[PDB]
Scaffold this active site. Structure first.
Site, PDB file in Angstrom:
ATOM      1  N   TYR B  26       0.804  -1.219  -0.087  1.00  0.00           N
ATOM      2  CA  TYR B  26       0.108   0.033  -0.015  1.00  0.00           C
ATOM      3  C   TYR B  26       0.891   1.340  -0.100  1.00  0.00           C
ATOM      4  O   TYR B  26       2.007   1.140   0.346  1.00  0.00           O
ATOM      5  CB  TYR B  26      -0.936  -0.030   1.289  1.00  0.00           C
ATOM      6  CG  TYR B  26      -0.279   0.434   2.465  1.00  0.00           C
ATOM      7  CD1 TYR B  26       0.466  -0.832   3.096  1.00  0.00           C
ATOM      8  CD2 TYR B  26      -0.212   1.588   3.132  1.00  0.00           C
ATOM      9  CE1 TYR B  26       1.029  -0.587   4.356  1.00  0.00           C
ATOM     10  CE2 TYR B  26       0.446   1.765   4.248  1.00  0.00           C
ATOM     11  CZ  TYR B  26       1.134   0.737   5.001  1.00  0.00           C
ATOM     12  OH  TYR B  26       1.557   0.782   6.083  1.00  0.00           O
ATOM     13  N   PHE B  36       2.271  10.191   3.777  1.00  0.00           N
ATOM     14  CA  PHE B  36       2.798   9.755   5.261  1.00  0.00           C
ATOM     15  C   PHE B  36       3.023   8.404   5.436  1.00  0.00           C
ATOM     16  O   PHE B  36       3.544   7.998   6.616  1.00  0.00           O
ATOM     17  CB  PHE B  36       1.180   9.926   6.166  1.00  0.00           C
ATOM     18  CG  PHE B  36       0.459   9.037   6.233  1.00  0.00           C
ATOM     19  CD1 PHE B  36      -0.665   9.355   5.145  1.00  0.00           C
ATOM     20  CD2 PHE B  36       0.124   7.964   7.035  1.00  0.00           C
ATOM     21  CE1 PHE B  36      -1.790   8.654   5.249  1.00  0.00           C
ATOM     22  CE2 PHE B  36      -0.982   7.156   6.839  1.00  0.00           C
ATOM     23  CZ  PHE B  36      -1.984   7.643   6.016  1.00  0.00           C
ATOM     24  N   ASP B  37       2.726   7.288   4.497  1.00  0.00           N
ATOM     25  CA  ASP B  37       3.227   5.900   4.914  1.00  0.00           C
ATOM     26  C   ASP B  37       3.200   5.197   3.465  1.00  0.00           C
ATOM     27  O   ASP B  37       2.240   5.604   2.466  1.00  0.00           O
ATOM     28  CB  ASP B  37       2.042   5.122   5.827  1.00  0.00           C
ATOM     29  CG  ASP B  37       2.521   3.882   6.287  1.00  0.00           C
ATOM     30  OD1 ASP B  37       3.729   3.684   6.211  1.00  0.00           O
ATOM     31  OD2 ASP B  37       1.942   3.338   6.877  1.00  0.00           O
ATOM     32  N   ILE B  56      -6.778  -0.390  10.577  1.00  0.00           N
ATOM     33  CA  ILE B  56      -8.028   0.846  10.886  1.00  0.00           C
ATOM     34  C   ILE B  56      -9.173   0.412   9.919  1.00  0.00           C
ATOM     35  O   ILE B  56      -9.168  -0.669   9.112  1.00  0.00           O
ATOM     36  CB  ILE B  56      -7.585   2.361  10.130  1.00  0.00           C
ATOM     37  CG1 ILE B  56      -6.895   1.973   8.821  1.00  0.00           C
ATOM     38  CG2 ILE B  56      -6.530   2.841  11.367  1.00  0.00           C
ATOM     39  CD1 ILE B  56      -6.584   3.500   8.369  1.00  0.00           C
ATOM     40  N   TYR B  82      -8.746   7.010  12.264  1.00  0.00           N
ATOM     41  CA  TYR B  82      -8.029   7.602  13.256  1.00  0.00           C
ATOM     42  C   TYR B  82      -8.928   8.591  13.888  1.00  0.00           C
ATOM     43  O   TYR B  82      -8.620   9.520  14.963  1.00  0.00           O
ATOM     44  CB  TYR B  82      -6.823   8.338  12.644  1.00  0.00           C
ATOM     45  CG  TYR B  82      -5.594   7.464  12.565  1.00  0.00           C
ATOM     46  CD1 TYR B  82      -5.189   6.666  13.735  1.00  0.00           C
ATOM     47  CD2 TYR B  82      -4.953   7.466  11.358  1.00  0.00           C
ATOM     48  CE1 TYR B  82      -4.136   5.452  13.196  1.00  0.00           C
ATOM     49  CE2 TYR B  82      -3.992   6.497  11.279  1.00  0.00           C
ATOM     50  CZ  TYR B  82      -3.494   5.665  12.138  1.00  0.00           C
ATOM     51  OH  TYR B  82      -2.423   4.689  12.093  1.00  0.00           O
ATOM     52  N   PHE B  99      -5.340   5.763  -0.041  1.00  0.00           N
ATOM     53  CA  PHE B  99      -4.565   4.645   0.043  1.00  0.00           C
ATOM     54  C   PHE B  99      -4.346   4.136  -1.239  1.00  0.00           C
ATOM     55  O   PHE B  99      -5.520   4.061  -2.033  1.00  0.00           O
ATOM     56  CB  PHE B  99      -4.912   3.599   1.153  1.00  0.00           C
ATOM     57  CG  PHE B  99      -4.744   3.896   2.568  1.00  0.00           C
ATOM     58  CD1 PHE B  99      -3.675   3.897   3.004  1.00  0.00           C
ATOM     59  CD2 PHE B  99      -6.052   4.456   3.224  1.00  0.00           C
ATOM     60  CE1 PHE B  99      -3.403   4.209   4.507  1.00  0.00           C
ATOM     61  CE2 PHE B  99      -5.729   4.670   4.606  1.00  0.00           C
ATOM     62  CZ  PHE B  99      -4.513   4.579   5.083  1.00  0.00           C
TER      63      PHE B  99
END
Ligand code: ATP
Lengths: 128, 107, 530, 242
Positions: B26, B36-37, B56, B82, B99
């Site tokens: 991902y 961020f990821d 999540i 979140y 994502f």
């Protein structure tokens, strides 16, 4: 004596005889700039603006607008002609008093920057 | 609370079933477009067992609706990602997470 | 008749290939109509009527047809390569003879200034055999196509010499030195300026064998190649072609920004004035001003003033006061995005870059049509209706932005204007003003409010999000679009292979080697740099 | 204090300068320079077609860039206006270019999801048809012969348009420019002409870099000054008054 005058009524309220003394300068400016062959034209926007159009203080900031290079040079000798008319009146005064050279009887170019202040504000004022 | 653009179609025939490890690869970006990821940054397929509260809410359902071998875009609203507290130091409060998910394998 | 140029002749679509300029006209038709009119004219002469051909009046366009005002491109090595001692040498190859300059530049040379016009460069102009440092003096010969110019500097004695194809160039007198009196300062960097349609090549001397005249003149003299000991290719910086927004310098020739503190009865202001207006060398051009900080719209668009409405609203405000005396028709007030890079001497609202992205369903019905642009502005001259005396109050063009809906509304002197814009969600809009300075006092950036609208600082700063008091923090400053910037040529480009496979296959483009760069992003300017 | 500073400064990503690893993006265009003007000889409808022979979705950790469409110049210069000479900017990262990536319409660095039969990112063995209409400003795309439910329209027409493809590393694409430069796999829409008909009689059609500078030996790199405006690209017959 008390430095109070009624002459600050709106111009529409001023009398006709008090009015000649303001446009005598304007008439003389018009004659000065027409005797030199200059054709003044009225554009579309000015005509439209005309077709539309104590007291509340509304002050005309006639200090920030600036004038073109050619118009500035043009106003240079037109202000020269204003000084020239001043020299005419003071030469009549010379003839009346029978002598005595005035300090600013000298030609236009012989005056300094701060001797030449009247012809400035009047000349580029009407041109602005 | 998550819809899905497919980016590259999968087989469309196999879907994650209960108690099965899902291997995904991902990349997660914020709404404004700031990453961020990314599992691709770490060069490592991400594994999680489905239906099991490991990741999540939004990622869970997006991977569930995913098919094998597909590449898809997941949009997770704050309620399923979140919440209003956010992830301290990473995810600002009330942030929508986007994502870029690919389901490499189901195990 | 409706005909059109083409590569082939087809009458059905009305496309005649002959529709080309006569300079590019095909030879057979050219010679046929040529000889026909030649015979017609010469028979006209044969009938006694003598045709006097007017003299060929020489005219020249100066070969200036480049992008807007750009007339040269300055190429120089990185500032960190400046040399403060020793003897150095590098070669400049002139592919096309023309207006080209080469020499040594201080690490402060402006990218938009001619080489040698100031004290920051020591260039050689072989187009006119000129030597440039704060002026032009006759020096040396004039090169031709393919000539190699060897630039060598001696920092120990503070001397520079130039060589054309190995021969040392001299002054008007037999002096070999071109420049002989200068301080070391911050060092010197190789530099070259290229005119319109001029091609040049630098050989810093990383491989000594590639140098063409170093051994002819420069080896035994003690001068060294500029990159003799370097292990890497020297990074080269070239003048940026695309103007960018940067803060107004405190030493600017014309622009003068004055920050005015907001009093109890007033609002914070950013007055813009021109230093050298009315004097000789005055600049009369459209100067593009923006504010350093943007207003970001909502990610998802919704589908005595009350403190609660003020707290819950997402509407912001800023005003621009055109001073009494400045021409309203020369002032444009509005918003721009980070994509605005259009520096043109003549600006009009009809030539702004725009596009309408139309998205429809399968049947073709347009379910939504969005319009995109980078310049949402209004012209003060057309905006102001009453005319005549504007001296009751300076022309206040209030700009209202709805960050929750994207609607851009303009209010001029208390009346709403018909002009409005609809930006996309998450658009970042910079308060900007475009004005031509026809007066020493040009305009202003009053940051006040109107009824039921939050101030600009409330949307600019997160800390002041719920603060209804207008503020002008130091981070918010007036910027202007300028060309004084440098651009870093990458040390390595993508390996792209192009070749036409066959007539039916076409042209193949093949890129396979991965190349990456890590970019630095400035959050407040919505731009990224390497 | 270590926990407070991090949690109150890092997540915003609005004060500290941000870093990101970005793939280099290059652009290639043919010699075509077509535009529209009043009283000039240019055909206002043009058509070219692009084929993808290979595209790795992830050569690196970043998604592979592949965008095709039309781009325009600023004025009459041969330079593509309003763009970077290098970096990660491609077709549609400005208001001078308009691109298609198989899922979005790119213009001004903003992407709009566009509908198409069997939507997918550009892959191997995908044929993209690009149509440009200069009479009424319009740009339309066709993927694998099916129409794409989107259109650019009402854009600026004051310069020279040209086909363009932008990409990162890991592609194999082929320009199908029509005629003897690649046979169209789908019939051009009625009215549109192949892009090879805009080539000048002496000049030859070739696909070159959109920007001046390439990867080559440094001392042999040709430094280019400002170029001359292509005033001959628009043949406007203006005879003397008679
Ligand atoms: N005497 C002439 N007769 C015909 N055309 C002429 C003559 N002189 C000049 N022309 C020009 O030559 C062109 C004639 O092209 P046209 O389309 O008629 O021919 P084509 O396509 O070669 O085929 P065809 O031989 O069937 O006419 C026109 O541009 C016309 O103005």
């Amino acid at each position: 004596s008390s430095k109070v005058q009624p002459l600050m009524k709106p111009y529409k309220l001023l009398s006709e005889k008090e009015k000649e003394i303001y446009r005598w300068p304007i008439k003389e400016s018009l004659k000065t700039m027409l005797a030199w062959g200059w054709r003044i034209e009225r554009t579309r926007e000015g005509d439209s603006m005309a077709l539309y159009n104590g007291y509340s203080p509304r002050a005309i900031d006639m200090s920030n607008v600036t004038l073109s290079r050619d118009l500035h040079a043009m106003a240079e000798m037109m202000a020269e002609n204003y000084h020239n008319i001043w020299a005419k009146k003071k030469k009549m005064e010379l003839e009346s008093k029978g002598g005595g050279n005035h300090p600013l009887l000298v030609p236009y170019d012989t005056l300094t920057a701060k001797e030449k202040a009247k012809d400035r504000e009047k000349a580029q004022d009407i041109l602005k | 609370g998550v819809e899905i653009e497919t980016i590259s179609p999968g087989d469309g025939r196999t879907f994650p079933k209960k108690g099965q490890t899902c291997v995904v690869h991902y990349t997660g970006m914020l709404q404004n477009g700031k990453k961020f990821d990314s599992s691709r940054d770490r060069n490592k397929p991400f594994k999680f067992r489905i239906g099991k509260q490991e990741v999540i809410k939004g990622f869970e359902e997006g991977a569930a609706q995913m098919s094998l071998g597909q590449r898809a875009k997941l949009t997770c609203t704050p309620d399923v990602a979140y919440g209003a507290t956010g992830h301290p130091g990473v995810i600002p409060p009330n942030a929508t997470l986007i994502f870029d998910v690919e389901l490499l394998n189901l195990e | 008749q409706g005909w059109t140029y083409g590569i082939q002749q087809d009458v059905k679509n009305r496309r005649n290939p002959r529709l080309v300029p006569y300079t590019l006209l095909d030879d057979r038709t050219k010679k046929s109509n040529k000889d026909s009119l030649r015979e017609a004219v010469r028979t006209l002469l044969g009938y006694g009527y003598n045709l006097e051909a007017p003299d060929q009046d020489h005219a020249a366009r100066a070969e200036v047809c480049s992008g807007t005002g750009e007339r040269f491109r300055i190429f120089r090595a990185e500032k960190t390569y400046a040399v403060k001692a020793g003897r150095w040498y590098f070669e400049f190859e002139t592919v096309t003879a023309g207006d080209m300059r080469v020499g040594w530049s201080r690490p402060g040379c402006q990218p938009d200034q001619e080489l040698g016009s100031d004290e920051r460069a020591f260039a050689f102009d072989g187009f006119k055999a000129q030597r440039w440092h704060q002026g032009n003096e006759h020096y040396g010969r004039s090169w031709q196509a393919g000539d190699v110019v060897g630039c060598m500097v001696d920092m120990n004695e503070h001397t520079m010499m130039f060589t054309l194809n190995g021969e040392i160039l001299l002054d008007d007198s037999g002096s070999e030195l071109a420049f002989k009196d200068f301080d070391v300062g911050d060092g010197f960097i190789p530099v070259c300026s290229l005119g319109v349609a001029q091609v040049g090549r630098m050989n810093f001397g990383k491989d000594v064998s590639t140098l063409k005249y170093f051994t002819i003149c420069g080896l035994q003299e003690g001068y060294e190649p500029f990159a003799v000991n370097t292990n890497r290719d020297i990074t080269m910086w070239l003048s940026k072609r695309l103007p960018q927004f940067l803060q107004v310098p405190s030493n600017h020739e014309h622009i003068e920004v004055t920050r005015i503190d907001g009093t109890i009865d007033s609002s914070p202001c950013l007055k813009v004035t021109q230093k050298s207006f009315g004097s000789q060398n005055s600049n009369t051009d459209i100067m593009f001003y923006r504010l350093s900080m943007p207003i970001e719209c909502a990610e998802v668009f919704s589908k005595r003033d009350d403190y609660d409405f003020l707290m819950q609203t997402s509407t912001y405000y800023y005003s621009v006061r055109i001073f009494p005396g400045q021409e309203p028709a020369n002032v444009w007030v509005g918003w721009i995005t980070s994509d605005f890079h259009q520096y043109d001497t003549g600006f009009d609202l009809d030539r702004v870059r725009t596009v309408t992205v139309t998205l429809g369903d399968e049947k073709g019905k347009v379910h939504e049509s969005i319009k995109r642009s980078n310049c949402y502005m209004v012209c003060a001259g057309e905006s102001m209706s009453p005319g005549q005396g504007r001296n009751n109050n300076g022309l206040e063009i209030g700009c209202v932005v709805d960050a929750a809906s994207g609607l851009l509304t303009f209010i001029a002197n208390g009346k709403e204007l018909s002009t409005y814009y609809q930006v996309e969600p998450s658009t970042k809009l910079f308060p900007a003003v475009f004005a031509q300075a026809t007066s020493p006092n040009v305009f202003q950036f009053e940051l006040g409010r109107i009824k039921n609208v939050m101030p600009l600082s409330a949307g600019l700063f997160k800390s002041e999000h719920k603060n209804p008091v207008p503020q002008c923090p130091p981070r918010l400053h007036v910027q202007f679009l300028s060309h004084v910037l440098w651009s870093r040529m990458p040390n390595q480009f993508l390996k792209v292979d192009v070749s036409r496979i066959s007539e039916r296959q076409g042209w193949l483009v093949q890129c396979l080697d991965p190349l990456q760069f890590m970019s630095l992003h400035i959050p407040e300017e919505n731009r990224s740099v390497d | 204090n270590q926990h407070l500073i991090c949690d109150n400064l890092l997540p915003g990503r609005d004060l500290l300068l941000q870093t990101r690893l970005v793939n280099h993006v290059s652009s290639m265009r043919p010699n075509i320079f077509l535009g529209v003007s009043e009283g000039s000889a240019q055909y206002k409808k043009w058509y070219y077609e692009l084929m993808v022979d290979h595209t790795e979705p992830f050569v690196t950790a970043e998604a592979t860039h592949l965008r095709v469409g039309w781009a325009s110049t600023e004025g009459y210069s041969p330079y593509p206006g309003g763009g970077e000479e290098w970096g990660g900017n491609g077709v549609g990262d400005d208001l001078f270019s308009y691109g298609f990536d198989g899922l979005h319409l790119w213009s001004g660095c903003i992407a709009r999801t566009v509908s198409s039969p069997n939507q997918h990112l550009l892959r191997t063995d995908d044929v993209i048809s690009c149509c440009l209409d200069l009479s009424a400003p319009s740009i339309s795309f066709r993927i694998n012969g099916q129409p794409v439910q989107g259109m650019f329209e009402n854009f600026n027409i004051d310069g020279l348009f040209f086909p363009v493809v932008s990409f990162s590393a890991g592609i194999k694409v082929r320009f199908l420019l029509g005629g003897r430069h690649g046979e169209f796999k789908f019939l051009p829409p009625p009215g549109y002409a192949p892009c090879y008909e805009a080539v000048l009689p002496k000049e030859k059609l070739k696909v070159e870099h959109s920007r001046e500078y390439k990867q080559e030996r440094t001392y042999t790199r040709d430094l280019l000054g400002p170029t001359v405006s292509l005033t001959q690209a628009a043949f406007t017959p203006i005879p003397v008054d008679t």
